[PDB]
Design a protein around this nucleic acid. Structure first.
Ligand SMILES: [K+]
Ligand SMILES: [K+]
Ligand SMILES: [K+]
Ligand SMILES: [K+]
Ligand SMILES: [K+]
Ligand SMILES: [K+]
Ligand SMILES: [K+]
Ligand SMILES: [K+]
Ligand SMILES: [Mg+2]
Ligand SMILES: [Mg+2]
Ligand SMILES: [Mg+2]
Ligand SMILES: [Mg+2]
Ligand SMILES: [Mg+2]
Ligand SMILES: [Mg+2]
Ligand SMILES: [Mg+2]
Ligand SMILES: [Mg+2]
Ligand SMILES: [Mg+2]
Ligand SMILES: [Mg+2]
Ligand SMILES: [Mg+2]
Ligand SMILES: [Mg+2]
Ligand SMILES: [Mg+2]
Ligand SMILES: [Mg+2]
Ligand SMILES: [Mg+2]
Ligand SMILES: [Mg+2]
Ligand SMILES: [Mg+2]
Ligand SMILES: [Mg+2]
Ligand SMILES: [Mg+2]
Ligand SMILES: [Mg+2]
Ligand SMILES: [Mg+2]
Ligand SMILES: [Mg+2]
Ligand SMILES: [Mg+2]
Ligand SMILES: [Mg+2]
Ligand SMILES: [Mg+2]
Ligand SMILES: [Mg+2]
Ligand SMILES: [Mg+2]
Ligand SMILES: [Mg+2]
Ligand SMILES: [Mg+2]
Ligand SMILES: [Mg+2]
Ligand SMILES: [Mg+2]
Ligand SMILES: [Mg+2]
Ligand SMILES: [Mg+2]
Ligand SMILES: [Mg+2]
Ligand SMILES: [Mg+2]
Ligand SMILES: [Mg+2]
Ligand SMILES: [Mg+2]
Ligand SMILES: [Mg+2]
Ligand SMILES: [Mg+2]
Ligand SMILES: [Mg+2]
Ligand SMILES: [Mg+2]
Lengths: 100, 117, 48, 55, 110, 150, 142
RNA sequence: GUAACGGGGCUAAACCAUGCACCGAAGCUGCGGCAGCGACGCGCGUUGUUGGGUAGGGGAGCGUUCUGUAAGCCUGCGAAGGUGUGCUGUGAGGCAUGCUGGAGGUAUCAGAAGUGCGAAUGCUGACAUAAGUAACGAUAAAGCGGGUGAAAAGCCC
RNA sequence: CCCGGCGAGGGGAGUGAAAAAGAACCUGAAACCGUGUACGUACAAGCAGUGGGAGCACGCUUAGGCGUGUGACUGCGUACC
């Protein structure tokens, strides 16, 4: 069984027991989040746009920063160079139940 | 207050040469070349964080098109149908369903067909 | 009050310009002199 | 005429791919003295094909 | 039980000596000594003396038997170059490098 | 730099970077581009700013309980052992002692104690007031330091 | 999750047989190119050959519109100076009729190692017979 | 050398008209993050908006050597340096630690600069490349026996 | 003591806290040159990377994926001053 839900301006196809990395949620580790807008559940219920009664429950398992990305900007012959680092925050959630 | 540059200079050159590991010839060995190689690698990586989003969407669309045409509908009509059905499932998920759950993809096509007809 | 707990007043000690020390500085390469001409030159510039 | 670009260590290695020496495939054994020798050459003790030919 | 001999500062470029070293790498020492005997190279003479030294070291110091020994490792490193001046035409001087080599033979019964 | 002013090689034709002096700062063994000269690093301190700083320092020493005042500070003989014992009785170790006048015996007693300095009131300086953990002042020295600073 | 990729060692490639008789050259070629590349499969992966083996029969009976039978010219250069050679469609059909389809498909396949690998799965025959009954090709109508 | 559709190919996959889909950018939106400027409130929140840049102006920092703080602190139970590895910050960077090293190092807050290099046909040293290539310097010329020697075309007879 | 030309050079032994402090001697960077191992590479066209990515090898705590090395194939892509 799997469900499709929106979180962090992205969509995620998940089953129970899966750990899913999302954009940071302002929720503590251990705490339960509910994704009540569920686009699809296949055991096939297809939302228009959301499956009536569909909730995915999940435990927040961790917050953290992803791998460092280096931003290099360089304009050849124009005496311009700029570097920046980036680490994107994430929230890992473990899916606990799907229910239409 | 004379300052010798050796220790700091070494550290800087080593930092660049570490980033140039795996590069061919002078590009992994020689500072002058490795520095250019590392800058260019960074320019490309910047560009390709944008291109990656283009390339994956292009891949998903191609797969949705294949799967849609197996179910007797073009990509362009399929997407129009899902929009008229008010299905907001994005191309990443549709392309994944197209591969991994062909029956659910068939159900999406049937929903899309019903919306157009 | 010790010799390692005295600070100058804020704004009293601005750092000097150091020309010709790389792109980041904003004064690299030409050192704020622009490109060529008499005013770019060492000892260059017209009298009062 | 001279190179416009320094040839690589790779290219140097590739040119030298034909420089390897060939070992003597086998040494012959004199039928009398039992000495190893180059085939069709006399032994170091001056035998050839069982006969003491030099001294 | 590996036993080494080296000829350090041998008067030959490493390139020239390496041609000979490649013939005997991995061979049994009896086969190696035969190969070197019928290799018509100055380097064969140099490498053979180092191999004979390594064998003698293995027998005397390490209590080996020649019949068990193989050339387990052999390599030639670049030694110090002697710098010399070659007079060329029109008063121009060239540097001659008289290249030297460090020859290392390792013999073992494993 | 010691050397000739001879141009190392001709301006044109040799294929080398143009040279003018063997003493060029670009060159090994050449001059230093902006060779240091002996400098006077002394700054002016306005009289009033000096005196103002001393008053601020002295006032902080009082607020921090680092200024101790005595009626008298003396040792009998010019003997380091006497001063060392006198100081450890007072719970002192690192101390500027400021007296009304230069006394021979206290000066000589303090000389081999690195943590201890003995001044007259005239020879106070702002660094020493801050540097030493405590400052002992004779009552006479206080009178003179007040007279100094007004 | 990461998007699926086909794996070359696990790809299922089916065998098909197409009759070229009376088909418009270019309109057949695009459908061949599509299927050789595997663009018809949901498992389509740009860097993997996911396509099918395709037998084309009756290549000599492929059709072209207009005056192309006489006027479509195939050029190649031999690499020797002045060595520009030409053949009309009708001459190509007479001499080497499989080449007409093969050339049409090759130009519609990706360039590079993978595109060349994709082309190897196309088996063009001048006539109505093939040697590949062992591969059990299914009829594919275009 | 096709060579005046980018190619294949196309009789539409051309052109015209009409219409609806879809693709398509670092544009716009979504989600997360950072910073500038300004409000409105109490350096914090909320909210608006801005953040492509050469010359160039303005602002804020990193690190290096040296002076004080320091007769302190760390260090033979292993300093600096060297070399890996891991962690960490928006960046210059920082921290930790394995190995090497074998005696120095130096927080903090201040102070001073021989304070940062890829270019200057830069300067010095080292080391490459061409390359085991050209060449081995008069085309008067060598051959053999014997000797000596670890070895002899070249030395001795 | 041993190999070697009563060599050069080396291997042992011994000294020393250390000889990978052995006199070409403190530390011992880099270019440059090797030996070994893993992976790739002999139908393949270009600034040699970057984005995607299979396979293989070696390690690891869902027994799982993960990490490290490599990088077939593929989109994009003409160094720096
Ligand atoms: K200026
Ligand atoms: K001089
Ligand atoms: K004293
Ligand atoms: K260390
Ligand atoms: K300090
Ligand atoms: K230079
Ligand atoms: K060479
Ligand atoms: K690529
Ligand atoms: Mg110094
Ligand atoms: Mg390296
Ligand atoms: Mg500027
Ligand atoms: Mg200029
Ligand atoms: Mg101008
Ligand atoms: Mg100007
Ligand atoms: Mg001048
Ligand atoms: Mg050129
Ligand atoms: Mg060769
Ligand atoms: Mg002359
Ligand atoms: Mg000097
Ligand atoms: Mg005065
Ligand atoms: Mg292309
Ligand atoms: Mg022509
Ligand atoms: Mg986009
Ligand atoms: Mg935007
Ligand atoms: Mg903008
Ligand atoms: Mg800007
Ligand atoms: Mg200091
Ligand atoms: Mg400088
Ligand atoms: Mg340099
Ligand atoms: Mg520059
Ligand atoms: Mg040279
Ligand atoms: Mg030769
Ligand atoms: Mg040549
Ligand atoms: Mg030749
Ligand atoms: Mg010749
Ligand atoms: Mg001669
Ligand atoms: Mg000799
Ligand atoms: Mg003779
Ligand atoms: Mg002669
Ligand atoms: Mg004679
Ligand atoms: Mg000796
Ligand atoms: Mg050591
Ligand atoms: Mg010496
Ligand atoms: Mg020492
Ligand atoms: Mg040393
Ligand atoms: Mg081919
Ligand atoms: Mg191949
Ligand atoms: Mg090529
Ligand atoms: Mg390209």
């Amino acid at each position: 069984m799997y469900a499709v839900f929106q979180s962090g301006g992205k969509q995620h196809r998940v089953s129970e027991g899966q750990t899913v990395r999302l954009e940071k949620l302002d929720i503590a580790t251990g705490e339960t989040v509910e994704f009540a807008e569920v686009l699809m559940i296949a055991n096939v219920k297809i939302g228009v746009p959301f499956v009536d009664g569909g909730v995915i429950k999940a435990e927040v398992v961790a917050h953290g920063r992803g791998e460092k990305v280096k931003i290099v900007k360089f304009r050849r012959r124009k005496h311009y160079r700029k570097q920046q680092g980036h680490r994107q925050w994430f929230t890992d959630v473990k899916i606990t139940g799907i229910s239409a | 207050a004379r300052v010798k540059r050796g220790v700091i200079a070494r550290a800087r050159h080593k930092k660049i040469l570490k980033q140039a590991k795996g590069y061919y010839g002078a590009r992994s060995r020689v500072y002058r070349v490795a520095f250019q190689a590392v800058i260019k690698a960074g320019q490309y990586a910047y560009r390709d964080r944008r291109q990656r989003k283009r390339q994956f969407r292009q891949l998903w669309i191609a797969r949705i098109n294949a799967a849609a045409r197996q179910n007797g509908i073009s990509y362009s009509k399929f997407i129009n149908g899902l929009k008229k059905a008010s299905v907001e499932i994005d191309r990443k998920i549709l392309a994944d369903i197209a591969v991994f759950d062909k029956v659910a993809f068939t159900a999406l096509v049937e929903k899309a067909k019903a919306a157009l007809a | 009050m010790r010799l390692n707990t005295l600070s100058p007043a804020e704004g009293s000690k601005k750092a000097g310009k150091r020309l010709g020390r790389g792109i980041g500085s904003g004064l690299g390469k030409t050192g704020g002199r622009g490109h060529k001409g008499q005013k770019s030159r060492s000892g260059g510039g017209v009298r009062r | 005429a001279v190179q416009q670009n320094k040839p690589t260590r790779s290219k140097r290695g590739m040119r030298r791919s034909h420089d390897a020496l060939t070992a003597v495939t086998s040494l012959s054994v004199d039928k009398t003295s039992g000495e190893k020798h180059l085939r069709h050459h006399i032994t170091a003790d001056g035998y050839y094909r069982g006969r003491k030919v030099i001294a | 039980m590996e036993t080494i001999a080296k000829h350090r500062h041998a008067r030959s470029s490493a390139q020239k000596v390496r041609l000979v070293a490649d013939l005997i790498r991995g061979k049994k020492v009896s086969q190696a000594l035969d190969i070197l005997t019928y290799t018509n190279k100055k380097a064969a003479v140099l490498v053979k003396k180092v191999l004979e030294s390594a064998i003698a070291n293995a027998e005397h110091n390490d209590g080996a038997d020649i019949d068990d020994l193989k050339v387990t490792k052999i390599f030639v490193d670049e030694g110090p170059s002697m710098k010399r001046i070659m007079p060329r035409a029109k008063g121009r001087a060239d540097r001659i490098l008289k290249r030297t080599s460090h020859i290392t033979v390792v013999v073992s019964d494993r | 730099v010691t050397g000739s002013g001879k141009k190392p090689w001709r301006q044109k034709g040799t294929g080398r970077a143009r040279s003018g002096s063997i003493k060029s700062p670009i060159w090994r063994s050449g001059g230093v581009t902006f060779a240091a000269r002996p400098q006077d690093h002394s700054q002016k301190v306005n009289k009033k700013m000096y005196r103002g700083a001393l008053k601020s320092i002295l006032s902080e020493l009082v607020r921090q309980d680092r200024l101790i005042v005595v009626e008298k500070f003396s040792v009998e003989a010019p003997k380091t052992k006497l001063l060392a014992q006198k100081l450890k009785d007072m719970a002192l170790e690192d101390v500027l002692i400021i007296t009304g006048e230069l006394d021979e015996n206290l000066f000589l007693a303090a000389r081999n104690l690195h943590k201890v300095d003995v001044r007259d009131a005239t020879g106070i300086d702002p660094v020493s007031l801050i540097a030493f953990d405590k400052v002992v002042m004779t009552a006479d020295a206080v009178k003179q330091v007040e007279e100094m600073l007004a | 999750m990461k998007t699926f990729t086909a794996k070359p060692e696990t790809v299922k490639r089916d065998w098909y047989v197409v009759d070229a008789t009376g088909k418009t050259l270019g309109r057949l070629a695009t459908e061949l190119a599509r299927r050789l590349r595997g663009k018809h499969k949901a498992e389509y992966t740009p860097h993997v050959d996911t396509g099918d083996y395709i037998i084309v029969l009756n290549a000599d009976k492929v059709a072209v519109t207009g005056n192309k039978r006489t006027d479509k010219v195939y050029y190649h250069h031999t690499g020797h100076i002045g060595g520009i050679k030409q053949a009309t469609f009708e001459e190509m059909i007479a001499r080497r009729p499989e080449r007409v389809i093969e050339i049409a498909v090759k130009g519609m396949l990706p360039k590079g190692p993978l595109g060349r690998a994709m082309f190897r799965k196309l088996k063009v025959y001048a006539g109505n017979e093939h040697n590949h009954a062992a591969q059990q090709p299914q009829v594919l109508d275009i």
